[PDB]
Amino acid sequence: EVRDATLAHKAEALELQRQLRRLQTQYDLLTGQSSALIQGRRARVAATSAVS
Amino acid sequence: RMLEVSREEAERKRMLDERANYRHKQALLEAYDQQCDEATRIFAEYHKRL
Numbered sequence: 001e002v003r004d005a006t007l008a009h010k011a012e013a014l015e016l017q018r019q020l021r022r023l024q025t026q027y028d029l030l031t032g033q034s035s036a037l038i039q040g041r042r043a044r045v046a047a048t049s050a051v052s
Numbered sequence: 053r054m055l056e057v058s059r060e061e062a063e064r065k066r067m068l069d070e071r072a073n074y075r076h077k078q079a080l081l082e083a084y085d086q087q088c089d090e091a092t093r094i095f096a097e098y099h100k101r102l
Contacts, residue, residue, distance in 0.1 A: 026053070034056035037064070044063035051070065 070077075095102055 030053040037060040040060035044060050044067040047067050
């Protein structure tokens with residue numbers, strides 16, 4: 001009866017931490033992996049101008 | 053933090069797949085140079101004066 005007054009906030013509680021851990025695996029983990037191929041673009045077009 | 057840009061991928065197809073068969077173009081360049089060569093062929097012994 002009264003736990004519904006309290007279990008209600010539990011649903012949103014697990015919602016934001018589930019976001020937060022989804023956020024947590026993406027704060028400093030995006031820059032760790034999304035820049036893996038950034039190094040290529042320096043030489044990925046140097047050879048393009050080389051055939052000219 | 054969307055700092056990935058797949059333009060490298062667009063150039064990954066471009067960067068060095070040309071060299072993996074670098075000699076396809078030289079066969080055609082031989083064909084383009086063939087008219088230069090065949091003109092040189094016909095300008096060899098008597099047309100050497102040309």
